[PDB]
Design a protein around this nucleic acid. Structure first.
Ligand SMILES: [Mg+2]
Ligand SMILES: [Mg+2]
Ligand SMILES: [Mg+2]
Ligand SMILES: [Mg+2]
Ligand SMILES: [Mg+2]
Ligand SMILES: [Mg+2]
Ligand SMILES: [Mg+2]
Ligand SMILES: [Mg+2]
Ligand SMILES: [Mg+2]
Ligand SMILES: [Mg+2]
Ligand SMILES: [Mg+2]
Ligand SMILES: [Mg+2]
Lengths: 177, 50, 84, 136, 116
RNA sequence: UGCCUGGCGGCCGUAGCGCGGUGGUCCCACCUGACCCCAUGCCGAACUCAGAAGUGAAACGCCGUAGCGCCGAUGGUAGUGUGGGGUCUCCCCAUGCGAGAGUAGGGAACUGCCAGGCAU
RNA sequence: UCCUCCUAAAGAGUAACGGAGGAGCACGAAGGUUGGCUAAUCCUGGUCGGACAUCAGGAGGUUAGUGCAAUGGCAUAAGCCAGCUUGACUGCGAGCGUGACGGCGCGAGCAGGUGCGAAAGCAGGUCAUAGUGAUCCGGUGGUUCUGAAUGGAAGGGCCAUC
RNA sequence: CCGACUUACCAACCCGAUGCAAACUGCGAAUACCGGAGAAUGUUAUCACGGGAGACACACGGCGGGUGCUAACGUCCGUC
């Protein structure tokens, strides 16, 4: 919670002063971070998915969820019930630890960096993004992983709109344009 | 009509039995069930037979 | 030819009538075990002193007078019995 | 040739043409052709009337078809005996009750619309009449 | 949401008890308080009640919302039912699991004398 | 006795949606923490436990308001049982029953038991 | 031969070489019970990834789902998931439905012995309706029955089965 | 590096106005049927058991329909 404490001492009041919120809990707070990574090639090789699951358990210290097909789609040759994806949800101290790790170490390590887009808020303030490459996390040992495998990071926030969503992210010195 | 009639014989040795069906191409292992034995009036293990 | 031979239909099949419906109506005095309605699904639900069988046959669980009523948030049709 | 693009079933019972009509008012245009009698309008009959009626007004105004052939009619072939299943669908018809408005017209003078409906009604088996729109 | 899910959980036991025509001991649980009512078979009238929102019970309770609070309210509700003449009831957890205070309340009622 | 709140019902849209406002004494909810009792195909989100710092934001309750949902006559029409007629693919007459849709309107529920808080 | 719908005229039933579709199974879990859970579709945002894979939010509210046709039913789910388990129990059976009959179906409750649940309780197969074949003749196991002078035995009977 | 517009093209979903349905139903009769009570009328007209049958080729007419051509002194059902 080394950034949870950082949140509650300045950021709450910072949004309070500049948005005229009536109560302090009206200042939004990030509730969970969902770590999604859909392999899409388990049909070709089941065995690449367990290795992929191990990769995501290294980057974030949690066992990932193996998602099911949930519906048969012939355009991709999938039948329902087949393992197709990997998922983790992080809340509380583990969530904050992953958040600070991402922003401080990993986000600078992005190749061909230009920062992050500020328009991917789905209209309701919840951020979602995709990293192009996976070696950027120091948890995984370079040269011991089979292939590069990106993933999607979505920040689900209590914020009801993107404007106050941007205030929360910016008060964390999130990389906006 | 792939499923075939099989006989479940009590392990109590009283000669009573039940009849049912089993698919033998899959699940080829024996079927075991605690079922009521009308002769000794108790629940005993019934084993696959026939 | 002098006559033109016809074809053949392909729709000749039908199944036997199952004699479904309400056996005893409102106001009937029934014994225990009497069948009130024979159903496919639960068009009528079981109320007080009325039981529902495996094929959703509603039967009397007591002697008395049959009564139909509408209850519940969904306006479903229940069958109950006033013990008499 | 008016005809449903697809149907739930390809054959239908004969039925009965009873009762009065629904849609007895001029709801779209300003003038209308209203059926006085009852009977069946084939798609060919409806379409032949439409050709004469649209050609009468020199392709002016707007023309509305208010009826649709949705009832299929089967006919047994020549020299086949009774039975051996129902016949094959030959054509489609609409059932017409007294008072139903069959065609509507707008954008043209009343004296021209009256003449156009005369030529159009010459193609229909059922008695018709000329009606205009009214405020209810 | 939360309350709607709990009602859907409780509904099957509630309707089954109504069909059986059994006196039903309903338990309610909130983070600060726990509630218990003995309900007549017709379901509209209550017979006895005991809760931690009560002047008599609160002074003894150090902190309401505890298992000891559940034991106190269970003994209290059980003695009131016993002295009115009600001896056989059916438990209605009201969509809660029989693990903590619901189990604690039920366990408290057992020693004092209810039959369920 | 009046108001507020919680629980269990009656009832099953006149009762449900939407829009706006309003409440934290108690209550309710959010909420604090979690080796633990207990739990997550992972995750204290839910469930559970230990608590009461903050807050009524959401939710929930209450108040107001017809943009809907809903209820809804009178009259007429359709149909129709019995008997009788015609120009008989369909109608009509005597008599009885009499819709559906729509219209004028109504309408922001009413109510029972107990428990608590405030006031008298 | 059997099941579902319409014809079939608002109880049941109702014909045609009338209009349309299915069955001759499957499952020791896909059954019992306890606990838990709730879709289709669309919009917005998001690595490969696009109309359409996994993810977050929203709308929407069953427009999904049911092992297999159709109808009726299903949220207290009868739909989905997990733990434990064999009640897919044995002898009966008030009463009732449906058939000319053969027969078919439903069933509380009683007895014995069980499973799940803290308990109230639930369980005598499966959301229901097709998945089927009389009698004779034999085969197999058991049996407190019979046994052509008697004691056996063969054969027969009864029960369970092919 | 993510962009912002535009035109007389196509245009799904949705809205408003229209119809149609044996295998459509958020509505819904008249009758018919089942049951309870009451009077009057009816040579028990009702049920059960037993002795004896015949009959199981129907026809037309009305009304409600399928089939046929709302053709047939056609054909197949319901009801009188
Ligand atoms: Mg067919
Ligand atoms: Mg009227
Ligand atoms: Mg009306
Ligand atoms: Mg109306
Ligand atoms: Mg009928
Ligand atoms: Mg009828
Ligand atoms: Mg099943
Ligand atoms: Mg001898
Ligand atoms: Mg004969
Ligand atoms: Mg004959
Ligand atoms: Mg005849
Ligand atoms: Mg004849």
């Amino acid at each position: 919670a080394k950034l949870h404490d950082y949140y509650k001492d300045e950021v709450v009041k910072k949004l309070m002063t500049e948005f005229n919120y009536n109560s302090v809990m009206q200042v939004p707070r990030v509730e969970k971070i969902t770590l999604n990574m859909g392999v899409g090639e388990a049909i070709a090789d089941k065995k690449l998915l367990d290795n992929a699951a191990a990769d995501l358990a290294a980057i974030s210290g949690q066992k990932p969820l193996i998602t099911k097909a949930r519906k048969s789609v012939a355009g991709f040759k999938i039948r329902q019930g087949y393992p197709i994806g990997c998922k983790v949800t992080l809340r509380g101290e583990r969530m904050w630890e992953f958040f600070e790790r991402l922003i401080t170490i990993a986000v600078p390590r992005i190749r061909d960096f230009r920062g992050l887009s500020a328009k991917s808020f789905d209209g309701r303030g919840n951020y979602s993004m995709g990293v192009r490459e996976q070696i950027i996390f120091p948890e995984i040992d370079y040269d011991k992983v089979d292939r590069v495998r990106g993933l999607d990071i979505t920040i689900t926030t209590t914020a009801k709109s993107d404007e106050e969503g941007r205030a929360l992210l910016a008060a964390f010195d999130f990389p906006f344009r | 009509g792939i499923r075939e009639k099989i006989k479940l014989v009590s392990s109590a040795g009283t000669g009573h039995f039940y009849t049912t069906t089993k698919n033998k191409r899959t699940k080829p292992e024996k079927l075991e069930l605690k079922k009521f034995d009308p002769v000794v009036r108790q629940h005993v293990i019934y084993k696959e037979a026939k | 030819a002098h006559k033109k031979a016809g074809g053949s239909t392909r729709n000749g099949r039908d199944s036997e009538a199952k004699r479904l419906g309400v056996k005893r109506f409102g106001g009937e005095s029934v014994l225990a075990g009497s069948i009130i309605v024979r159903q496919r699904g639960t068009k009528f639900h079981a109320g007080a002193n009325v039981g529902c069988g495996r094929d959703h046959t509603l039967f009397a669980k007591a002697d008395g007078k049959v009564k139909f009523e509408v209850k519940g948030p969904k306006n479903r049709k229940f069958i109950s019995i006033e013990a008499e | 040739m008016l005809q449903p693009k697809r149907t739930k079933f390809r054959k239908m019972h004969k039925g009965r043409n009873r009762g009065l009509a629904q849609g007895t008012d001029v709801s779209f245009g300003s003038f209308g052709l209203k059926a006085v009698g009852r009977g069946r309008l084939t798609a060919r009959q409806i379409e032949a009337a439409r050709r004469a009626m649209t050609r009468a007004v020199k392709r002016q105004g707007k023309i509305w078809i208010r009826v649709f052939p949705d009832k299929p009619i089967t006919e047994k072939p020549l020299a086949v005996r009774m039975g051996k299943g129902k016949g094959n669908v030959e054509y489609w018809v609409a059932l017409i009750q007294p008072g139903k408005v069959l065609y509507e017209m707008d954008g043209v003078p009343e004296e021209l619309a009256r003449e156009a409906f005369k030529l159009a009604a010459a193609k229909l088996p059922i008695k018709t009449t000329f009606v205009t729109k009214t405020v209810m | 949401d939360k309350k709607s899910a709990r009602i859907r959980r409780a509904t099957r036991a509630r309707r089954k008890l109504q069909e059986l025509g059994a006196t039903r001991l309903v338990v309610h649980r909130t983070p600060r308080h726990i509630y218990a009512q003995v309900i007549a078979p017709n379901g509209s009238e209550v017979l006895v009640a005991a809760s931690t929102v009560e002047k008599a019970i609160a002074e003894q309770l150090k902190y309401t919302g505890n298992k000891d609070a559940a034991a106190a309210v269970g003994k209290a509700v059980a003695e009131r039912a016993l002295e009115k003449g009600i001896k056989d009831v059916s438990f209605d957890r009201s969509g809660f699991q029989y693990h903590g205070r619901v189990q604690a309340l039920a366990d408290a009622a057992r020693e004092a004398g209810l039959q369920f």
